[PDB]
């Protein structure tokens, strides 16, 4: 099974670009999850780095739109993004030093993060960003 399945009932924000970027994230996490069941460390690292770069770009996209529109919860929302980015960058520094491995607990963690963040945090910007 794919780790992550996107539906509108679970995750739709009413903001087209954000929904699309979320779908990409889910697909990139699913590839990482599959590779993380192997010992193909170079393929894990390529997919890890591609996912994290995309996630940072998604967060920048949401942040630019929230801040330009004076969205009410912008700074607290960005704080949640920045703590995930710090976790991911720390994981990359360790993984790329040989000091940690990426496995399916890594991808279930990131799944947990997104499945909580999108409904509880991202959906709240829908009225403002869709107006």
Going by the annotation, the residues of the binding site for Fe cation are 22, 58, 62, 77, 81, 117, 122
Pick out residues in 62-91 that bind Fe ion (CB under 5 A): 62
CB of 93 to Fe ion, least distance (A): 23
Tell how many helices (H) and how many strands (E) occur in the chain.
6, 0
Say how far apart CA 42 and CA 33 lie, in whole Å. Answer: 14
Residue at shortest CB range from Fe ion:
122
For 77, half-sphere exposure in the C-beta direction (CA atoms, 13 angstrom radius) is: 24
C-alpha 109, offset from chain centre: 11
CB of 106 to Fe ion, least distance (A): 19
- Residues placed in the known binding site: 22, 58, 62, 77, 81, 117, 122
Binding string, residues 20-59; x marks residues near Fe ion by CB under 5 A: ----------------------------------------
Say how far apart CA 32 and CA 49 lie, in whole Å. Answer: 10
Of 1 and 131, the one with the shorter C-beta distance to Fe ion is 131
Pick out residues in 112-131 that bind Fe ion (CB under 5 A): 122
- Closest listed residue to residue 35, CA positions, set 83, 109, 103: 103
Q: Does 19 bind Fe ion (CB under 5 A)?
A: no
Using alpha carbons only, how large is the chain's radius of gyration in Å? 15
The site for Fe ion (CB under 5 A) is made up of 62, 122
């Amino acid at each position: 099974m794919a780790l992550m399945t996107w539906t509108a009932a679970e995750f739709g924000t009413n903001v087209g670009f954000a929904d699309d970027q979320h779908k990409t994230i889910f697909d990139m996490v699913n590839k990482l999850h599959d590779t993380a069941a192997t010992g193909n460390r170079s393929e894990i690292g390529k997919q890890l780095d591609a996912l994290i770069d995309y996630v940072v770009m998604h967060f920048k996209s949401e942040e630019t739109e929230m801040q330009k529109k004076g969205y009410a919860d912008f700074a607290a929302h960005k704080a949640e993004h920045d703590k995930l980015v710090g976790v991911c960058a720390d994981l990359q520094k360790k993984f790329h030093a040989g000091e940690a491995e990426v496995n399916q607990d890594t991808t279930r963690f990131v799944r947990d993060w997104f499945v909580n963040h999108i409904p509880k945090v991202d959906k709240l910007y829908g009225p403002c960003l869709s107006a």
